[PDB]
Amino acid sequence: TEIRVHQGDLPNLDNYRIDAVAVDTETLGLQPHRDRLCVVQLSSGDGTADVIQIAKGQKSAPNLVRLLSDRDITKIFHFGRFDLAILAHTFGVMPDVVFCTKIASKLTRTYTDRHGLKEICGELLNVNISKQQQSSDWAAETLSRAQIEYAASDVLYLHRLKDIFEERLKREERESVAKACFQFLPMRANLDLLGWSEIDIFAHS
Amino acid sequence: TEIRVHQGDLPNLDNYRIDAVAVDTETLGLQPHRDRLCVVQLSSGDGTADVIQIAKGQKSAPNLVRLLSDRDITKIFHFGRFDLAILAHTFGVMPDVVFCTKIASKLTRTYTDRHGLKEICGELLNVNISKQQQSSDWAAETLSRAQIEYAASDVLYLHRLKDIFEERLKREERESVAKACFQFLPMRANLDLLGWSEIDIFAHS
Amino acid sequence: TEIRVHQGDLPNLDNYRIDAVAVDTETLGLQPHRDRLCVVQLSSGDGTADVIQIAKGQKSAPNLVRLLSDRDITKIFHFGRFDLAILAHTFGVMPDVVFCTKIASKLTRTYTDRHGLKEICGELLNVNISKQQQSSDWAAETLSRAQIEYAASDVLYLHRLKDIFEERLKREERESVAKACFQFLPMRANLDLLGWSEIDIFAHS
Amino acid sequence: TEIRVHQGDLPNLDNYRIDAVAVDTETLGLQPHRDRLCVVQLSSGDGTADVIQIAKGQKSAPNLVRLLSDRDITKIFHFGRFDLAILAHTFGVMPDVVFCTKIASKLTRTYTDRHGLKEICGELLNVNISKQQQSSDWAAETLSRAQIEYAASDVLYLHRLKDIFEERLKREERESVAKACFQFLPMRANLDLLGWSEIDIFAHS
Amino acid sequence: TEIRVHQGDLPNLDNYRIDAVAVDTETLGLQPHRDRLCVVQLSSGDGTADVIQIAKGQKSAPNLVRLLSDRDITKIFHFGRFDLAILAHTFGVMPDVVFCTKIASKLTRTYTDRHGLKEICGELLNVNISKQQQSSDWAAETLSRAQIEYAASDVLYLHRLKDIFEERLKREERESVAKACFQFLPMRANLDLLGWSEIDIFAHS
Amino acid sequence: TEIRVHQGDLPNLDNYRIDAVAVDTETLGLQPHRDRLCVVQLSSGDGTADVIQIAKGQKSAPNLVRLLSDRDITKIFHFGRFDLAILAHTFGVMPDVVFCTKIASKLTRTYTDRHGLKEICGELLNVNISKQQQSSDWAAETLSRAQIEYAASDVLYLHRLKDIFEERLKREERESVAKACFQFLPMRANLDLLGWSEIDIFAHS
Amino acid sequence: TEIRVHQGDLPNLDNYRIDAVAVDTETLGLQPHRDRLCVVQLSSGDGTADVIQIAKGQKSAPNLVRLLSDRDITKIFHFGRFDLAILAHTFGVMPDVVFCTKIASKLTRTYTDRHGLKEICGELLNVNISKQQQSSDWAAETLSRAQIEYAASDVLYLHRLKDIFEERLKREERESVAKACFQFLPMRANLDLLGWSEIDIFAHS
Amino acid sequence: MTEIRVHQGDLPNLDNYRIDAVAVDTETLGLQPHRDRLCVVQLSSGDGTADVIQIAKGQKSAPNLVRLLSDRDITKIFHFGRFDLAILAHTFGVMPDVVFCTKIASKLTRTYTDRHGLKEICGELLNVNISKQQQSSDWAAETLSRAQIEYAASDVLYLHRLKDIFEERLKREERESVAKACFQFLPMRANLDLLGWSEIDIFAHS
Numbered sequence A, B, C, D, E, F, G: 001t002e003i004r005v006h007q008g009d010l011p012n013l014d015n016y017r018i019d020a021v022a023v024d025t026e027t028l029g030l031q032p033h034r035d036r037l038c039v040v041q042l043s044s045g046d047g048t049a050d051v052i053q054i055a056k057g058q059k060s061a062p063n064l065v066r067l068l069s070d071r072d073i074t075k076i077f078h079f080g081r082f083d084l085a086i087l088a089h090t091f092g093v094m095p096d097v098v099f100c101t102k103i104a105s106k107l108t109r110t111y112t113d114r115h116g117l118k119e120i121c122g123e124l125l126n127v128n129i130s131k132q133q134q135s136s137d138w139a140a141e142t143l144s145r146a147q148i149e150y151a152a153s154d155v156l157y158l159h160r161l162k163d164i165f166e167e168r169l170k171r172e173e174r175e176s177v178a179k180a181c182f183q184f185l186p187m188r189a190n191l192d193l194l195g196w197s198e199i200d201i202f203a204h205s
Numbered sequence H: 001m002t003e004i005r006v007h008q009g010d011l012p013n014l015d016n017y018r019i020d021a022v023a024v025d026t027e028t029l030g031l032q033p034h035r036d037r038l039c040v041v042q043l044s045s046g047d048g049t050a051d052v053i054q055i056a057k058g059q060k061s062a063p064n065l066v067r068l069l070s071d072r073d074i075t076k077i078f079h080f081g082r083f084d085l086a087i088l089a090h091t092f093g094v095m096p097d098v099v100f101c102t103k104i105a106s107k108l109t110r111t112y113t114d115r116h117g118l119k120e121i122c123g124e125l126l127n128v129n130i131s132k133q134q135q136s137s138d139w140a141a142e143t144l145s146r147a148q149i150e151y152a153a154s155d156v157l158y159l160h161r162l163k164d165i166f167e168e169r170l171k172r173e174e175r176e177s178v179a180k181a182c183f184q185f186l187p188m189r190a191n192l193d194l195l196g197w198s199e200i201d202i203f204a205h206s
């Protein structure tokens, strides 16, 4: 599978004149106010990926952010709640047309309690995802080949996953439920940035 | 406190030609598929209330449901997640223009972890709510005077509470956050009815 | 006020030619293999009670046991799971026609999570039960007046509670459910005596 | 080895003129009000199995339901609490002559705390059960061969387990205990459907 | 009423030519290696008490220690596990003829789960113990009158408790059980001093 | 009680030519990145207090900040870990000569596990602190009298508590331990601001 | 490894004219009042073992009990708290001269938290113990070869462990501590049988 | 199978430790210094060799080792030094006050994980596999096994390399002064443990 590695930004959007784009990020951790965005990965669904190294203190990624703000393009994530938070924190733009495979799994894979990307890829696609590079130094000046291949593999399958989940959402008649969850997801990420990351805002207590 | 007690439905909407109505419910418990709607309470905010006794197996309430369907009329609840579920389950209409004082409290009363109606009324209004009649037989053929007064007092204050929360939401610049939460609330209630009542659909796990 | 205090057994069944008898016990604790039966209390529901001091090592009580054996007489308990175990363990007979007000509460008072005898008397009868003497030396040769009145008060109201609960079970169409629970309750008590007291036999784990 | 796959129902009862039938189900999850019945599996104990695909929306399965309601045929389950609830919810008939290998294990295999089907088959029968297909799309129009073999294996051994457990129940003199448990189990499943699925109805609290 | 306050040690043992002496201690906390012994209290059971202030760094108290070493006098404590440890740690002598009212309560008051001194005095003696001064500066040069009265109250009643507990231990035939617990209790206190204070040495894990 | 209420800053330092100043803050909550500083309170120990209302968005307070950075003036706090973080976060200066009565309590009141300000003032000074205004709108344009008196109450006694705690630290020879804890406290507060507020940095895990 | 299997009792004591005997039991579970003694295993330390099948209802085993009652012979167990309980419950004699390798491990292997027999055998002897047969039907009429070898292996090594543990206890100067623990252990087992099996009798609460 | 010098009681001299930083670890009979004695002290200069020092029961002095511990010009490197500092100070009466802890360093830099054990850190940063099998063993044995000795040495052979990497990360994320304050308080943290506060986060609200 072809992986294109970039510094800072995509050089252009030639490969992203499409209706939906798979998005993932790597960071120094789970706390966007502390842990910087280090890598953004994209795939058009054609078996190739773009891996974009983000510099310390980088405030701009023009072509990437054009995709993120384009209401005609659905941004596909796995657990987008996190990626939306770090992307909006880093570049100041909250994507608002999204699809999340973790939310979709929670709404359709009711026969299991494991909604991780690895389990979903294994079941739906007979694809083995390795999480070994997940805990590595994503801020390294030069990413290792293992790191680059891991980062790319997290976006290579989200299109195929979205297609299968859309089928299940239609079959079980939960399309409008999923859509409302995806519509609120960017606000759920904003709530995390604002200080409510540990609070289920809809809970009784 | 004037309290108009009705059987089944409001006689007409003469007292509710208004832009926002306070709504509450009494039931036989917290599980809408098991525990029937017993009472619906309404207030226009003029210090009076309508207490509507709902019969076992009752399927319609035309005037009430017209109110719940009116996009021009904001339905105010305290923890509307529950009331929206039981009203939609009982009469078949999910209100879609709502305001919840519990969500508003969680977004503004950041200096406490107590977001109950009693606490909010004591703090914001120096008004003492008693919960003694909360655990009583709300399916009784004839409600007691104590029950009627308790049921009415849960809607008598929601207009004033909402006015104060709107002030705080404006002060701390959280108006669009609250709006997104209220927009998703009916679907959060629907998710409860559909079987996800114990699941934070947005959580990692 | 009329509390008849007996040593060992009822003198006769003259006061219990009735359809249902309220039963309760006091012990040295919650473990029937260690904690002996100390007192058995009985009421016909007429506002009087019979309090029977059971001696250490007592193996028989023919009149009481005739009541417990009599299929035409329903034995009413609050949380009979306990009283059935210690009665069967002490006298060798397991009553098989029973009504439990705690199980009835759990099947009807779905609007609360408190199903203790004190809360139920307070809510259903506006009758105030004290538990101050519950923790006392029930094996003392001479029971105190406080002890005797406490023991009597635990049976004086079970008829009235059963009457209200049977209406509720009829209103919510759960009579057959309650009956099955009461039918298994003697076996749930045997399960406790046999060594499964800490196991919900129907749980997945 | 020999698995007969059917759409909708058994074609007739020619293979089930027997004293006891092994039964199992596959579903979209553990909540019958949300998660539909997808497969019912049957075995006469002769080392063959019938695997019946249940359509979305299917309200009748007349031959299967004849078996389920025939009081002269014991239905054998592993953790029948679940299967009874989904079968009664789907087709409206609660089987009432049952044997549950999980309850029987909890009454006899007191030397272990593991009462799952895989653990019981390994110990009692030296049969290796794989649970890999347990979390799969049981609503798929075409079940995979691995799904079909998994579903069949859950009923192929229940007669042999029952025979062994009956020997242990007799040896430890717990036959009447188990019988009472099996007699209540259909009402325990009914309690689950009615809204008490999280409540041990016999517990103190 | 009569409380004799001493610096360092009793002047003599003239008041303690008796079969049993009540003993208690006050400290700066629960960790004997950090928190010094501040006060030792004694009573003969005649309704008077001796309150002995222990100085920082004090290593001997010959009269007190002669009492504690005397095999012919039973030392009565409430929860002697603690007192034994700080006494042995401070003066180098571990008493080995003891009675503990907390252990005795746990072997006899099986009808409650509260085995604190206040609860036991309330139930068995109708005596009100206040623990208000328990958290106070016990190392103060001058103990307050409330501290002095509190420290004495902790030994004034132990003989009367021991007498009641010995009757219960006899009635329930647990005298040899209790004797074995008391015999091990000095070694349990030693175990705490040696570093096993958080470990139940007899537990499986 | 003379309470001087100010907008924005002290008008001058004429009352704070002293070696130690008592400091406290009120906020909209416990998260300094979300919850703004609303009130700063100061006392010289003379039984009077200054209560300074801090405006939304206020970036400087030159007289208050002069005291905070003055290395010759010890800043006394109760649980200064919090106040230090919100003061540094708001005005940009981390005080580094501090005394915390909560840390001092944990190092000296080893005979209790309650180290809150209310409990400490009760025990050490016989002063009753009310917490009723703690959960109130500290951002209000006009503070109520009850709010103002509460805010002043949290600084009026800190000098007296520090004097007592210093006596105890000397008595138990923990002065250098206390000093090292106070020296690290500003870095502990910084760690909180940087994103480690939920982490004990010195724990094994 | 020679393993002598017997029905009911040792035929004679010819192999046990020794100072110390290794003892273990197998049962139907961990609750002596419910789960019967099925097997008793003995070793003299010579690398051979005796495995004694205990029949259901068996009330005597004279030669075995002679060994258990003999104060000149130390009975070695691993976690004898359990074996002492079930032996005394079954044959009515509590062994009173014992050594427990789990208590010894807890007093000497302070560099670990794993005190199970497998861990101890592997570390101290480089001997691999398998627990695969631990959960099997020990009441089976004919024990499997695997069961017989498992049962023997639990006593084959206890002499060698005791010798090492005694060396550690001497080295760390804990011999009198261990001896007091061993002296109390039969009463600890008695406490279990009498109803205190879930209670640390020496705990504060 | 590296060069491991085994000594009884103390280093014979300081010839191998005229350096600015020394890697330090200990083995004991357990985690409670008042009960569980110091049994082994291990040292490395970072050159791929280690000294393993058996401490006798009751041993009160270790002059050469303690000279290193109190030398303010030498940084003592530990993994989770909170523990080693407590047992060393309890045994020989000197608390080292110039230290670097790789566990604190990991908690301040490897924010992308929740696993800060030495085995994980060595695997990730150095592709070095550490075995913990000998951790639970009789460290007070008169003669240590070969496996024990190699385990003890391996716990110090890599700390210099870890410290170098962590110092780069601390610089990169601008947390050097944060780390320095943590290391300066760590000896007092270990002292608090000895004094009776081992179970208490002294900076917590409750």
Ligand SMILES: Nc1nc2c(ncn2[C@@H]2O[C@H](COP(=O)(O)O)[C@@H](O)[C@H]2O)c(=O)[nH]1
Binding pocket: A024, A025, A026, A027, A028, A029, A030, A134, A135, A138, A154, H111, H112, H113, H114
């Ligand atoms: N602290 C912590 N961070 C994680 C964990 N899992 C992932 N991360 C962080 O969050 C990012 C998520 O990336 P992904 O999981 O898509 O590889 C990682 O680059 C890593 O920095 C975890 O379990 N703990």
Ligand SMILES: Nc1nc2c(ncn2[C@@H]2O[C@H](COP(=O)(O)O)[C@@H](O)[C@H]2O)c(=O)[nH]1
Binding pocket: A030, A078, A079, A102, A115, A116, A117, A118, A134, B204, B205
């Ligand atoms: N917010 C949050 N993220 C987690 C948690 N556990 C794992 N993660 C991270 O969230 C991402 C998605 O996890 P997955 O859904 O693939 O298990 C991964 O980077 C994973 O390491 C958690 O408990 N909370």
Ligand SMILES: Nc1nc2c(ncn2[C@@H]2O[C@H](COP(=O)(O)O)[C@@H](O)[C@H]2O)c(=O)[nH]1
Binding pocket: B024, B025, B026, B027, B028, B029, B030, B134, B135, B138, B154, C110, C111, C112, C113
């Ligand atoms: N089971 C249960 N039901 C409650 C509880 N609190 C409130 N409810 C139910 O919720 C309904 C509405 O609550 P309310 O508006 O009275 O606060 C009540 O009529 C009552 O049936 C509770 O704590 N437990």
Ligand SMILES: Nc1nc2c(ncn2[C@@H]2O[C@H](COP(=O)(O)O)[C@@H](O)[C@H]2O)c(=O)[nH]1
Binding pocket: A204, A205, B030, B078, B079, B102, B115, B116, B117, B118, B134
């Ligand atoms: N869903 C849910 N409702 C609760 C819970 N606890 C209390 N309630 C009910 O929810 C309603 C609102 O609670 P409040 O916010 O007034 O405390 C009341 O009827 C209260 O009894 C809970 O844990 N879950």
Ligand SMILES: Nc1nc2c(ncn2[C@@H]2O[C@H](COP(=O)(O)O)[C@@H](O)[C@H]2O)c(=O)[nH]1
Binding pocket: C024, C025, C026, C027, C028, C029, C030, C134, C135, C138, C154, E110, E111, E112, E113
């Ligand atoms: N240990 C313990 N025993 C109790 C408790 N409550 C009741 N008991 C025991 O169980 C008996 C039940 O009697 P009742 O609750 O009807 O008064 C009492 O006589 C007493 O011996 C309890 O909370 N703890």
Ligand SMILES: Nc1nc2c(ncn2[C@@H]2O[C@H](COP(=O)(O)O)[C@@H](O)[C@H]2O)c(=O)[nH]1
Binding pocket: C030, C078, C079, C102, C115, C116, C117, C118, C134, D204, D205
């Ligand atoms: N079996 C059992 N009984 C309890 C428990 N807690 C309290 N009890 C006792 O059970 C009896 C019934 O309590 P009630 O139903 O009146 O709350 C009382 O004696 C009470 O003290 C418990 O957790 N388990």
Ligand SMILES: Nc1nc2c(ncn2[C@@H]2O[C@H](COP(=O)(O)O)[C@@H](O)[C@H]2O)c(=O)[nH]1
Binding pocket: A110, A111, A112, A113, D024, D025, D026, D027, D028, D029, D030, D134, D135, D138, D154
């Ligand atoms: N959510 C969830 N569903 C399960 C789990 N295990 C089994 N199921 C559901 O229960 C059905 C029956 O389980 P089975 O008989 O295959 O063990 C399965 O088809 C599946 O839908 C589980 O762990 N979680």
Ligand SMILES: Nc1nc2c(ncn2[C@@H]2O[C@H](COP(=O)(O)O)[C@@H](O)[C@H]2O)c(=O)[nH]1
Binding pocket: C204, C205, D030, D078, D079, D102, D115, D116, D117, D118, D134
């Ligand atoms: N109700 C319930 N079902 C469970 C739970 N855990 C597993 N199950 C499912 O229930 C079924 C019982 O199978 P077992 O675990 O007894 O072999 C399986 O489908 C299993 O996955 C649980 O905690 N509760």
Ligand SMILES: Nc1nc2c(ncn2[C@@H]2O[C@H](COP(=O)(O)O)[C@@H](O)[C@H]2O)c(=O)[nH]1
Binding pocket: E024, E025, E026, E027, E028, E029, E030, E134, E135, E138, E154, F110, F111, F112, F113
């Ligand atoms: N840390 C702490 N120490 C206590 C507590 N209760 C009692 N103590 C200490 O233990 C000593 C025992 O005294 P007594 O409880 O007999 O008055 C007291 O002097 C006090 O130092 C407690 O709850 N926490």
Ligand SMILES: Nc1nc2c(ncn2[C@@H]2O[C@H](COP(=O)(O)O)[C@@H](O)[C@H]2O)c(=O)[nH]1
Binding pocket: E030, E078, E079, E082, E102, E115, E116, E117, E118, G204
């Ligand atoms: N170990 C321990 N001792 C306590 C605790 N609380 C009080 N104590 C001590 O135990 C004795 C009596 O406690 P009581 O049984 O009255 O609660 C007193 O010496 C008291 O200081 C505790 O939580 N743990």
Ligand SMILES: Nc1nc2c(ncn2[C@@H]2O[C@H](COP(=O)(O)O)[C@@H](O)[C@H]2O)c(=O)[nH]1
Binding pocket: B110, B111, B112, B113, F024, F025, F026, F027, F028, F029, F030, F134, F138, F154
């Ligand atoms: N969320 C929350 N905030 C608190 C709590 N206690 C105090 N605060 C906040 O912390 C500030 C500290 O004020 P103080 O505790 O000194 O009165 C308060 O003004 C309030 O905003 C609490 O328990 N929960």
Ligand SMILES: Nc1nc2c(ncn2[C@@H]2O[C@H](COP(=O)(O)O)[C@@H](O)[C@H]2O)c(=O)[nH]1
Binding pocket: F030, F078, F079, F102, F115, F116, F117, F118, F134, H205, H206
């Ligand atoms: N950081 C933190 N502060 C708390 C917590 N609980 C209460 N507080 C607040 O911290 C302040 C000091 O608490 P105090 O020591 O006076 O109890 C008060 O404002 C109190 O409400 C907590 O769990 N964590």
Ligand SMILES: Nc1nc2c(ncn2[C@@H]2O[C@H](COP(=O)(O)O)[C@@H](O)[C@H]2O)c(=O)[nH]1
Binding pocket: D110, D111, D112, D113, G024, G025, G026, G027, G028, G029, G030, G134, G135, G138, G154
């Ligand atoms: N219920 C249960 N029983 C056990 C367990 N482990 C051992 N047993 C029982 O305890 C007896 C003695 O254990 P063993 O000496 O073989 O380790 C066994 O024969 C078995 O009946 C367990 O984990 N759970």
Ligand SMILES: Nc1nc2c(ncn2[C@@H]2O[C@H](COP(=O)(O)O)[C@@H](O)[C@H]2O)c(=O)[nH]1
Binding pocket: E204, E205, G030, G078, G079, G102, G115, G116, G117, G118, G134
């Ligand atoms: N009483 C008790 N026994 C246990 C527990 N866990 C395991 N056992 C059983 O106790 C015996 C000794 O366990 P070991 O010390 O070898 O781990 C084994 O038969 C084991 O299965 C437990 O938590 N409590």
Ligand SMILES: Nc1nc2c(ncn2[C@@H]2O[C@H](COP(=O)(O)O)[C@@H](O)[C@H]2O)c(=O)[nH]1
Binding pocket: G110, G111, G112, G113, H025, H026, H027, H028, H029, H030, H031, H135, H136, H139, H155
């Ligand atoms: N009790 C206990 N002690 C440990 C544990 N891990 C390490 N130790 C002790 O701590 C010492 C130092 O650990 P090391 O530096 O070998 O990792 C060991 O020699 C051992 O005594 C543990 O998990 N539990």
Ligand SMILES: Nc1nc2c(ncn2[C@@H]2O[C@H](COP(=O)(O)O)[C@@H](O)[C@H]2O)c(=O)[nH]1
Binding pocket: F204, F205, H031, H079, H080, H103, H116, H117, H118, H119, H135
């Ligand atoms: N204080 C403490 N030490 C531990 C704990 N768990 C493991 N240790 C020991 O602390 C040392 C460091 O562990 P590591 O950081 O390498 O996981 C090892 O000797 C390890 O065995 C714990 O929970 N607390």
